[PDB]
From Swiss-Prot, chains A, B:
Residues of the full protein shown: 745 to 837 of 1101
Subunit structure: Homotetramer.
Protein name, entry field: ATP-citrate synthase
Record note on modification: Phosphorylated by PKA and GSK3 in a sequential manner; phosphorylation results in activation of its activity. ISGylated.
Disulfide bonds: none
Record family assignment: In the N-terminal section; belongs to the succinate/malate CoA ligase beta subunit family.
UniProt subcellular location: Cytoplasm, Cytosol
Superkingdom of this protein's organism: Eukaryota
Gene: ACLY
Protein function: Catalyzes the cleavage of citrate into oxaloacetate and acetyl-CoA, the latter serving as common substrate in multiple biochemical reactions in protein, carbohydrate and lipid metabolism.
Binding-site positions, CoA: L21, K22, E23, A24, G25, V26, F27, V28, P29, R30, S31
Length: 79, 79
């Protein structure tokens, strides 16, 4: 994070560090807003090549909420 | 309800009343377990003849639950 800190030591700037990671074989997106896209696009290539065998998702047990927490969120209403 | 009350005045029995409603133009199912099917099968023909124009469902406002009610159901947990 922090490429546009310079837009307000040279090798320890975020732009040049991201670019040196990108030139050395780290799957770097063009900015932060493509981070979900590049994670998704790596994971699709990992599923579609027999690398990751995903887990069949099962519902968990469920606790009741805390009163002192679910009072702040406004789900409980007592006078 | 109550066709098999006799299986433990004659025209005031549930079997004969259901059959007399069925002979007079009331859409009676064969028993209670086809009631949802016959309601659904009437409603489909009511949609497919331009009779009922259904409402576009919109989410409602939401109140918080009562504490004294949502304590009995076990959603709230305070010592």
């Amino acid at each position: 994070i922090g490429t546009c800190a310079t837009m307000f030591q040279a090798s320890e700037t975020a732009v040049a560090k991201n670019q040196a990671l990108k030139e050395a074989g780290v799957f770097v997106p063009r900015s932060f807003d493509e981070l979900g896209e590049i994670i998704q696009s790596v994971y699709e290539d990992l599923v579609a090549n027999g690398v990751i065998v995903p887990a069949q998702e099962v519902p968990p047990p469920t606790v009741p909420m805390d009163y002192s927490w679910a009072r702040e969120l406004g789900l409980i209403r007592k006078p």
